[PDB]
Amino acid sequence: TSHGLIESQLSYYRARASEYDATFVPYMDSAAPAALERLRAGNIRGDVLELASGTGYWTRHLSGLADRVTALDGSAEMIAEAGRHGLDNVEFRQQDLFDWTPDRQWDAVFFAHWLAHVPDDRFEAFWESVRSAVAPGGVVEFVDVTDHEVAVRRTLQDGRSFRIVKVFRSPAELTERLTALGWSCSVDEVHPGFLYATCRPGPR
C-alpha cells in the first residue's frame, strides 16, 4: 500500500466530515443497540484511547463511560465536528494512525469502523502500535462489519476521486490473525453484518 492510498482515504474523510453524521447515524441505527450493549459491558473503564474518532459518534459514549478519553483522528475537520458534543473529559489529537507510535498507555482502546480501512500489509504494524498503547491488564475493543481490490473508488459529482480501503474481515479471519499476532480474542456478530471484538494481548 502506497502513501498515496493512505492520503487519498484520509482526504475522503476530510471532504465528508460535515455530512458524515447524516449518512452514518441512520446507517448505524439498527446495529447500535447490540453494539452499545457490548460497549457498556464493563471493559471501557479508566483511561480510554479511541482511534479514528471521526465525528465523535462513539466518543460521546466513551466519554460517559471513561474517566478520561484521548481521541485520535487524522482529520482536523472530523475533530472540529466532534467538538460539537462538548465533551469535557476528552482530548482530541490529530494523528495519522499509519505513522503512530504511542508514548503512553491506556486501560482500554476502542475503535469503530477503523480496521476495515487497514490493508493486510499494514495490519501487523498497526497492531504493534495498539499493543504498545495497552496498559497492563488493558483491553482492546472494536466494532466493524463482517464479510460473509484492497480499495474502492468513490468519485464525488464535482469530480474529486478517492480510493478508500475496504477490507471487511470475518470473525474467523480476525480471530485467526489476531491469535497469530499474540492476542486472545472474542469476535461476535452482534447484529447481522456487524461485529464486536474484545481482545487481550499475550506476553508478546
Contact 135, 106 (CB under 8 A): yes
C-beta of 125 vs 182, nearer to ligand SAH: 125
In angstroms, rounded to a whole number, what is the distance separating the alpha carbons of residues 57 and 44?
15
3-state secondary structure of 127: helix
In angstroms, rounded to a whole number, what is the distance separating the alpha carbons of residues 44 and 64?
10
Residue 73: strand pairing partners: 94
Which residue, among 74, 131, 62, has the nearest Cα to 102 in the 3D structure? 131
Q: Tell me which of 8, 38, 49, 58 binds ligand SAH, using CB under 6 A.
A: 58
C-beta of 54 vs 138, nearer to ligand SAH: 54
Q: Tell me which of 66, 70, 71, 73 binds ligand SAH, using CB under 6 A.
A: 73
Binding flag, residue 54, ligand SAH (CB under 6 A): yes
Spacing of C-alpha 95 from chain mean position: 13
Exposure string over 175-202, b if 16+ CB within 10 A, otherwise e:
bebbeebebebebeebbeebbbbbbebe
Candidates 30-38, 49-57, 153-161, 195-203 — which segment interacts with ligand SAH by CB under 6 A? Answer: 49-57
CA atoms in the 13 A half-sphere facing the CB of 182 = 10
C-beta of 124 vs 202, nearer to ligand SAH: 124
Binding flag, residue 6, ligand SAH (CB under 6 A): yes
67 is in an annotated binding site: no
C-beta of 9 vs 70, nearer to ligand SAH: 9
Site pattern 107..126 for ligand SAH (x: CB under 6 A) = -----xxx--x---------
Binding region for ligand SAH (CB under 6 A): 6, 9-10, 13, 24, 52-54, 57-58, 73-75, 78, 96-98, 112-114, 117
* Residues annotated within a binding site for S-adenosyl-L-homocysteine: 20, 58, 73, 96-97
